[PDB]
Enzyme design. Structure first.
Site, PDB file in Angstrom:
ATOM      1  N   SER A 167      78.412  54.732  93.385  1.00  0.00           N
ATOM      2  CA  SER A 167      79.898  54.193  93.177  1.00  0.00           C
ATOM      3  C   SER A 167      80.900  55.139  92.514  1.00  0.00           C
ATOM      4  CB  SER A 167      79.469  53.036  92.329  1.00  0.00           C
ATOM      5  OG  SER A 167      81.071  52.698  91.567  1.00  0.00           O
ATOM      6  N   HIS A 197      85.044  50.827  97.284  1.00  0.00           N
ATOM      7  CA  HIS A 197      86.301  51.878  97.040  1.00  0.00           C
ATOM      8  C   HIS A 197      86.466  52.736  98.395  1.00  0.00           C
ATOM      9  CE1 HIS A 197      83.539  55.019  95.256  1.00  0.00           C
ATOM     10  NE2 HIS A 197      84.553  55.647  95.920  1.00  0.00           N
TER      11      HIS A 197
END
Length: 198
Positions: A159, A36
């Site tokens: 994450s 991401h």
């Protein structure tokens, strides 16, 4: 630049994330990080200088990427712990209940234990499956950064997690934290990467 787990890098002069681990791909130098943090071909900078570009990523579904670095970068088998370092010695995956630490540019080096595996995060962009959960705290900008045991076994890359209104989950008890990392082993095999160790 010297490539050390946990240090800041920027993406297209915009977002900030943290380095996961120094790796090689044949002759190519790299570091793993979270997917991401950048799109394919996005430019990574450390210390104001271009160091490489995102070679590949998967996000959402997974949350992984690697940055392909110029040959002038210096790969190191290390993760930042304050002004010190933790040596990266391998990639043995630890079990639920093990102690683990993580390193990143917002909250620094934080430790806790692994509480669960195979956790799904429902992020803005979609689900990410298969994440390992710990209760070390973290905050925004720590994404991509190293998760490693004190004994030097690299676990994965940061994450996401249940950040609070202050941007981190360090102000709630460990029992209330969900700090989620992408396992390192599938990143290494999906991209043919070897971990730099010492």
């Amino acid at each position: 630049a010297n490539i050390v787990g946990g240090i800041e890098y920027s993406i297209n002069n915009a977002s900030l994330c943290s380095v996961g681990f120094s790796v090689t791909r044949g002759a190519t130098k790299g570091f793993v990080t979270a997917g991401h943090c950048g799109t394919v071909n996005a430019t990574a900078r450390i210390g104001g200088a271009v160091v490489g570009t995102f070679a590949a990523r998967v996000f959402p579904g997974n949350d992984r990427a690697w940055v392909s670095l110029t040959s002038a970068q210096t790969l190191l088998p290390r993760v930042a712990n304050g002004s010190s370092f933790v040596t990266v010695r391998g990639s043995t995956e630890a079990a639920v209940g093990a102690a683990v630490c993580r390193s990143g540019r917002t909250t620094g080096y934080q430790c806790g234990t692994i509480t669960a595996k195979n956790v799904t995060a429902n992020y803005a962009e979609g689900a990410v499956r298969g994440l390992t959960q710990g209760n070390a705290c973290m905050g925004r900008g720590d994404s991509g950064g190293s998760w490693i045991t004190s004994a030097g076994q690299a676990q994965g890359v940061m994450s996401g997690g249940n950040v609070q209104s202050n941007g981190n989950n360090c102000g709630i008890p460990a029992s209330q934290r969900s700090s989620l990392f992408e396992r390192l082993q599938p990143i290494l095999s999906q991209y043919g990467l070897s971990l730099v160790t010492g």
